[PDB]
Amino acid sequence: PTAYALAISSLGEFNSLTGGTSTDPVAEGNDYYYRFEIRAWEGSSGPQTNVTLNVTRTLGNSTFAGSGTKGVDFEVELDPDGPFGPASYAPVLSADVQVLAWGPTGVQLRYLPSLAPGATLRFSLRANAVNGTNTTVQADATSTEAPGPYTVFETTTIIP
């Protein structure tokens, strides 16, 4: 059988850490936010542990912003019933996220609680728009139990 599975999705760029409106292109000198989801398979043989997002800049000049402050530079939200129920995304406790790395060209965030089958996490990441070269970021999802990584690339058009 398939014991455990995870998935990743890009949701594109937004003008706010939470809520707000979509964006892209972005004018150089403005902040913007990437969002990614990590999604636990509903058929998983149990909760998944060490669910980790690794995002690296692959092309262009934009930078992950700030020092790594939850609620300013990044946010992790949990939808405990995923798409399968009406519960909405809500920010998780600060203690529930370990910032493994936070720098201008790479960020790594680990969810410390276990992630129930079907549940999803939404990661929002603040960035500084820089260039008229596009910025492309690589986002990798892994967990202990799932045969990761699962990778996407999202691209932002920067106006000089």
Ligand SMILES: [Ca+2]
């Ligand atoms: Ca839900």
Ligand SMILES: [Ca+2]
């Ligand atoms: Ca985009």
